Design a protein around this ligand. Structure first.
Ligand SMILES: Cc1c2cc(cc1C(=O)Nc1cc(CN3CCN(C)CC3)cc(C3CC3)c1)OCCCCCCCNC(=O)c1ccc3ncc(n3n1)C#C2
Length: 296
């Protein structure tokens, strides 16, 4: 109802960028979208099924995405519901999702990994903190709106040119991340490795469970995208989480940044730091002078 609409003629599909079980994303030109840019590139999502349910979920995602538009939430330009197929039009983010980006600039990266956008070699402390800070700011906004994400992970963040990082949600049906979910029969899937004890045990998801998940995202960032509890099966991960075991400090993570993770991982939800306090801490370190960060 409140969604911006884009005329079908104004969208010109170029080629497929990627897909999940239920959706495909295309690169496209979109014209008369932004005035200063007669023709810009966008990412266009189309459904891979019809009849009723997914079309409801389409307009659900649309109204939600419009409501949640903010500087570090994925940018949504609107819909094309003029006939079929139904299309959702997103800002194009060249470096794709944050987990891919992290893995392609990890401990073994060298000169080749550098580009117009990012330095060669492994992402430096300054850059890792800048990424962490942007994700935290997005979570601050969502906590402000009392939106509970429930699947916060680097795989669900996008990275654009300039290394602008924004929080999205691709659902749980990309083959490449099937391993990041524990499938409970037909119920269906849970990102247990990112979930706090009270979510695993009591099936409660709150703003405080999101702070825990952000703690795990912070860990992902400083391990350059490796899966949490990678050494464990799903049931062994559930055992470890519920019994209070904690992810170890990443090699690239200074003790002070680890203190922030652990503050997200307080067993009792009310004892966890607020996301706004986490963001404040991370932004300070992100913006701190090289002289300070070099001995951090
Ligand atoms: C950006 C994006 C693209 C493609 C998508 C989805 C999204 C997205 O974030 N949507 C989204 C939805 C909600 C609602 N939410 C709540 C309840 N949930 C249970 C469900 C849904 C909330 C939020 C904000 C967190 C508040 C964001 O759908 C397609 C998924 C299929 C796999 C993706 C194909 C691989 N992607 C690419 O190949 C690619 C490459 C470049 C690029 N630039 C922009 C995009 N993009 N994509 C996009 C998108």
């Amino acid at each position: 109802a409140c969604v911006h609409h884009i005329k079908r003629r104004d969208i010109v599909l170029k080629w497929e960028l990627g897909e999940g079980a239920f959706g495909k994303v295309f690169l496209a030109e979109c014209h008369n979208l932004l005035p200063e840019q007669d023709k810009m590139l966008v990412a266009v999502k189309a459904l891979k099924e019809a009849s009723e349910s997914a079309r409801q979920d389409f307009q659900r995602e649309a109204e939600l995405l419009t409501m949640l538009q903010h500087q570090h939430i994925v940018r949504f330009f609107g819909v094309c519901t003029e006939g079929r197929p139904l299309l959702m039009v997103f800002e194009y983010m060249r470096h794709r999702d944050l987990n891919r980006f992290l893995r392609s600039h990890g401990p073994d990266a060298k000169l080749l990994a550098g580009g117009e956008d990012v330095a060669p070699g492994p992402l430096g402390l300054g850059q890792l903190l800048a990424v962490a800070s942007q994700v935290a700011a997005g979570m601050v906004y969502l906590a402000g709106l009392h939106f509970v994400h429930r699947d916060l992970a680097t795989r669900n963040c996008l990275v654009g040119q300039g290394l602008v990082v924004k929080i999205g949600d691709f659902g749980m049906s990309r083959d490449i991340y099937s391993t990041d979910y524990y499938r409970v029969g037909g119920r269906t899937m849970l990102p247990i490795r990112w979930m706090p004890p009270e979510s695993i045990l009591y099936r409660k998801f709150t703003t405080e469970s999101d702070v825990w998940s952000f703690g795990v995202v912070l860990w992902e960032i400083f391990t350059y995208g490796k899966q949490p509890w990678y050494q464990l099966s799903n049931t062994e991960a559930i055992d470890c989480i519920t019994q209070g075991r904690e992810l170890e400090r990443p090699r690239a993570c200074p003790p002070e940044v680890y203190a922030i993770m652990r503050g997200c991982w307080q067993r009792e939800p009310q004892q966890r730091h607020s996301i706004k306090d986490v963001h404040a801490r991370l932004q300070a370190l992100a913006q701190a002078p090289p002289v300070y960060l070099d001995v951090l």
